[PDB]
Amino acid sequence: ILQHPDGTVLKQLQPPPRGPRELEFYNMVYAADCFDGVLLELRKYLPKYYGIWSPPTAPNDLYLKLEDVTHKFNKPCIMDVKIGQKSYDPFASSEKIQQQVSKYPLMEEIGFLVLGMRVYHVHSDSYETENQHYGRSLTKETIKDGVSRFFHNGYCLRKDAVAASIQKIEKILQWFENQKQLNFYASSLLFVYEGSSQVEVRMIDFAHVFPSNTIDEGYVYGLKHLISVLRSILDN
Ligand SMILES: FC(F)(F)Oc1ccc(-c2onc3ccc(-c4nnn[nH]4)cc23)cc1
């Protein structure tokens, strides 16, 4: 991700078939002639899409031009959470499946994985960053406190941001409860809240979204478990 000062991000297409699939996803969703009520509703929860972009002198070099969801914040606290029971898609080989489950074998049990967080600390006037190893080290014992850490800001636990996150996730859950046409593997929720002394939840990362004729039960499971953890944190 490259943050552009104009309030967009440039995401370089991943190698094929992943990058091309993510392009086609955005193209289908934001199709100008699209009057599919499900897909029109979905736009609310995605970064706004500005189309394929490549440098003037390099047509080979493909990016997606997306809304920077953090742009309206002064000191954004950002957490990326991969959603679902399976990080591998319906067309994964035995090795690929093994690779993906190996990356985090608790995915079926938990239904989500913290990919990373960036948390502004008022007292320090500085950022605390967690990488992929943080979330992958979280067990069932430690997942609540693992998530809680994101909301330690402003000399307190930010229960306001926790509550807001629940309410916004619930809207995304409601969308998933009323669509049977897309299944989402290895996609994320991007959480943002304001860390400054003076909330966004968006769906991102669509290299493994596939047509379906059933409920995306793994994604729903993830959302519901995430909501339950967040709910529990409100009792801290
Ligand atoms: F550390 C930091 F770079 F600042 O953290 C940041 C800052 C900004 C974003 C961010 O903002 N709007 C986004 C829209 C899409 C994506 C995206 N799509 N697929 N993969 N990532 C990321 C987006 C993400 C992380």
Side-chain angles (χ1 to χ4, degrees), residues 1-196 199-236:
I1 279 301
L2 279 301
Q3 285 183 113
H4 199 304
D6 65 351
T8 65
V9 299
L10 289 181
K11 189 192 178 171
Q12 188 172 57
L13 265 72
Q14 295 163 260
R18 291 182 299 169
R21 281 201 303 248
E22 182 167 42
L23 169 62
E24 202 70 285
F25 172 75
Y26 275 107
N27 279 346
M28 163 193 81
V29 171
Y30 285 85
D33 63 351
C34 174
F35 297 120
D36 179 358
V38 166
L39 291 182
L40 288 184
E41 183 74 14
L42 176 58
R43 291 180 183 181
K44 301 175 194 303
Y45 306 112
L46 269 48
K48 178 167 179 176
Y49 177 53
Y50 294 102
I52 192 73
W53 181 98
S54 53
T57 59
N60 52 280
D61 189 3
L62 302 183
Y63 303 76
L64 305 181
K65 191 170 171 62
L66 300 176
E67 173 186 2
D68 184 349
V69 171
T70 72
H71 179 64
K72 287 176 179 172
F73 294 80
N74 174 50
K75 300 288 179 181
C77 304
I78 306 154
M79 174 174 71
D80 181 332
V81 184
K82 186 176 280 174
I83 304 299
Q85 290 184 288
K86 310 181 198 317
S87 295
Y88 55 84
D89 64 39
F91 300 110
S93 57
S94 298
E95 291 66 45
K96 175 61 68 175
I97 290 170
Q98 195 173 257
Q99 181 209 61
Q100 282 301 302
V101 174
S102 176
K103 192 177 68 68
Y104 185 64
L106 283 172
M107 196 70 74
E108 198 79 52
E109 299 180 3
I110 300 187
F112 64 80
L113 171 67
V114 183
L115 293 188
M117 55 177 80
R118 183 153 164 285
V119 185
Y120 182 64
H121 292 308
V122 175
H123 75 298
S124 305
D125 171 49
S126 68
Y127 271 101
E128 179 213 308
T129 58
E130 303 304 318
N131 62 43
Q132 280 186 56
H133 297 105
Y134 174 78
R136 289 202 290 131
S137 62
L138 296 188
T139 173
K140 185 149 276 287
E141 271 205 72
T142 56
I143 193 66
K144 171 165 171 290
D145 286 342
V147 173
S148 294
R149 174 176 290 286
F150 177 52
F151 297 104
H152 292 178
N153 172 256
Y155 306 108
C156 71
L157 175 65
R158 290 292 298 282
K159 288 187 181 176
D160 61 307
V162 170
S165 296
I166 295 171
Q167 291 175 302
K168 281 160 184 288
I169 293 167
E170 171 59 23
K171 297 301 300 191
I172 295 175
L173 171 67
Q174 282 168 4
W175 182 78
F176 272 85
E177 282 170 6
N178 294 289
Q179 75 91 0
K180 319 84 167 63
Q181 68 191 73
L182 292 171
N183 287 2
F184 293 70
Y185 303 97
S187 71
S188 280
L189 293 181
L190 189 65
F191 295 73
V192 190
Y193 75 83
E194 182 55 72
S196 77
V199 165
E200 276 286 2
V201 180
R202 296 285 188 95
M203 289 165 71
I204 65 169
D205 198 3
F206 303 116
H208 309 265
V209 177
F210 290 83
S212 187
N213 59 13
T214 84
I215 296 289
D216 188 345
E217 315 99 339
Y219 198 107
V220 164
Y221 172 81
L223 290 187
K224 282 193 70 66
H225 187 218
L226 183 55
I227 282 177
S228 192
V229 170
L230 289 172
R231 174 61 186 79
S232 189
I233 294 167
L234 291 183
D235 299 317
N236 279 2

